[model samples]
Target: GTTRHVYDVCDCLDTLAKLPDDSVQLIICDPPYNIMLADWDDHMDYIGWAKRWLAEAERVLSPTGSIAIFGGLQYQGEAGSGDLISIISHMRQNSKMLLANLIIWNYPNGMSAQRFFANRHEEIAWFAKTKKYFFDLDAVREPYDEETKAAYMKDKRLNPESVEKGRNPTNVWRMSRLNGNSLERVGHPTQKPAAVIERLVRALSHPGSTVLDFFAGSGVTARVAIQEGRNSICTDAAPVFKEYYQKQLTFLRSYEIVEGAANFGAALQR
Candidate 1:
């Protein structure tokens, strides 16, 4: 059982400021790429603006906590305001967090490219607040089929129990991207697939812990958190977020939506 909350329209920094120190377990941060694709995607000093929330994100994470940041590595020029490489470079110099993993999300479909290889991947940087960060690899482990399990079970080098439990889904994930006609779509321009978010939620944070998504685009993090039995607080600066979030609710099991941060705080206490 878990409780969740959503802010119709709240600034990332403003909402983050309300949470106590080291209170959150996992943070799903899909910051703007500064690609100018939308109104909120533009920023003169992207890192400068990002640092504010970066600092707050670190302050809010528990000792055994982690943060997953989504971005592309292609943007790195005068016009390109921000990207994962710049963020990772900044973290190396200024932050004490540990670099857990750099996951490559490989999608099957994408826009055609002639000048260069067609882009078909995105990066997700996972950073742990401390060495004690929690991760349950078993929770997100992929199960082997009957044929594979039987073959592995007969092999003397392989552990029978491990084969039965399935194998670890490595850093490079091959989940399909949400197409325009996808049933999971809720009209958000840059919505991430629930399968990807679910993996992050299941492995990085334990059940009953709080998962915070400051830039909750389609509210997929909250949806996955609810189904995974994790409490969550999701907020976005856009008011249209509520409409998308309501759509995500239709796919989830029974979940309680708290009124605001006040009720969110109270719900966690219980």
Candidate 2:
């Protein structure tokens, strides 16, 4: 009977503005880049579009909260081709955020560009509200096997105490491609692999923390958050993808949709 509401995977600025301030612990969003992808003609300008909801997100995020914006190398406005980098830069100037990491998610499949190498990767920019943020490094530590431990032991003789023993992951993360046969696949044109978002969820936020995604494409963010032990609120503008979003939850049976937001504390029990 203590359930929290999970907003739509797609939301407008008006809807996002209603969210309480400092209420979210983590935000992992993939808003459209006005790419006019395929036959999708309806797209907004970069600066104009960003001004719409960036502030709303800032309002809802906790002081120690973190955000990860998923974007591509494609250029926009006067920001050059580093869309992810530019977005992070803009957010830092307007909000109380500190740039943390720029993760590169590589894949083995994608269209073959004629001029350059096929763009088989995307970028995710990490930002925290303050210098002190909630990232449980121990929760996502790497394992130490016998051979690996032995290697470290040998190095220990040279330098009595080293900082290499305690597990810590690097900035660059290499993940596998989403397979057509995988259960997480939702038939989206540009679906993110489950492995990709799992790393973000594990590294940035803690268990039971709240995560928000305004552009919840195939709802992969929700799947990763729920299955990995975090509450998620996602919003999407495309009603056509509503079925796809629900199907994602159905496939990942670890979460529940908390309904009824009629009033502030009107039995938030779904």
Candidate 3:
């Protein structure tokens, strides 16, 4: 395992990057799509491009690793017959990795809807490379508030340790997306909350292992990876990805900043 932190901007990836097979423990990916991309329309060309990264993400995962792809359940006018959903169905037919869970990220902030139901959530497709995928549920567990803990404790029928450890994070995550004045904001409009990425990082990856993001979201993947004591390689085609990469570190005002550069750079060398 390597703790080398890397972030770069390149469209010539896959060909530009390489990691040994079964090395990375986790991957956070979102290859932006829909019929709008000039390179792809009607899904054919897009699926072709999607499969390449999909293969690389799959190939790099340790047997216990998993890839969580941020994508669509596009409704009505926004709907476009493009990548993702077609890719999942394709994976079911051609790949052994189980399409683990289609996690719905429910958030409060977003546009109002009329012709259809009010849109409030986004879908993340999780695929496990093997049946024995690594998941430390406790790492990301949402602890019961004081009242709930006290209420549950009196019930002897419930397992004491389970009560103490807290509850599983729901598939419909309630964490809101970053907004103005948010310390974690790096100017990526869709920048996921740090807590959101942390839950995925901690639960899917382990300390001292590697994580990679094919299309780094505000470089939050590597930021969380570094903070959580995991190695990471995050490369994105967005030229501003580098700007956010530095900005993400700028906002690393939390605990690890106190760890000092001496220990920090040493952490990278691990």
Candidate 4:
């Protein structure tokens, strides 16, 4: 109900245009894979569009920043269509960003498929703007079970203080995709679980820096971003984006909210 966040209505490139270069600390991207899942899930010349945003994402990233693009590894895009694999290849060839991690989001549930073995996981290709990109493993670490903690502390191979802080969450994440009773969700759809998004935010979000999500159909970005005390800009081409955003209040003080570009810069002033 209060100042450091914005949600505008615009397409990706248009949204990117409003921000200055090297200003964002982290980007949580979940562009559609053109897989025909819903009405908004169709776009041809896929990588062509992706490359544009990829370049812009690199430009807008703080030297010590990163972008995590969420998608499935193999989704059989029409020859010219898209998937995370294509995004990865294109990033390898076209950008100078480092391949920090190809995070595997493993879930316990999936659509029971008879023809193809039930799907169990998806991937997030995290690319760093530079070798200096930011990350705080401890921010998102998993506290060890009491027994596991006890064992680790007794071993000289492991440091006691480090053990108490907890263990690295690792690249393979285990979370349920149960945003609803529908199906398995990997990176995100309209609304990703706070746990998944929180992990990304807590680790990479620098103090007073802003998080930018151009494909912000879900208000989850705003919810997590504000809660983390980081400023944020969440916009989508979808006109209904604000309705989803409104739902978040039922869900901030470091995070005041505003509208329009006039307020955008002020939000970033931090």
lDDT of each: 0.85, 0.68, 0.73, 0.80
Expressed as tens digits, the lDDT of each residue in 1-270 for candidate 3 is: 435576666652452245667877888887676434664543555556666667777887789989888877662334444545767876888788987788888888888877878888878888999999998899988789888998899999999789889998878788787779888887897787878788888988888877778678588887888788787777777788888888888765222221211222333333
Clashing pairs in model 2?
8-234, 8-235, 9-234, 9-235, 9-236, 10-235, 10-236, 10-237
- Tens digits of per-residue lDDT for model 2 on 107-162? 67667788987787788888888888888776666657767666777884544233
* Model 4 ranges off by over 4 Å: 1-3, 35-44, 181-189
> What is the C-alpha lDDT profile of model 4 across 141-232, one tens digit per residue?
88999999998888999889899999888999999665565332222355677778888988887767888898887667888887887888
- After superposing candidate 3, which stretches have Cα over 4 Å from the reference? 1-3, 15-17, 34-43, 75-83, 253-270
Tell me the deviation in Å of residue 134 in model 4: 1.0
Better of 1 and 4 by lDDT: 1
- Which clashing pairs does model 1 show? none
- Error at 240, model 3, angstroms: 1.6
- The C-alpha RMSD in Å for every predicted model, in order, reads 2.6, 4.5, 4.8, 4.0
On TM-score, the leading prediction is 1
Q: Supply the TM-score for candidate 3.
A: 0.85
Using lDDT as the measure, the top candidate is 1
Which ten-residue region of model 4 has the weakest summed lDDT? 181-190
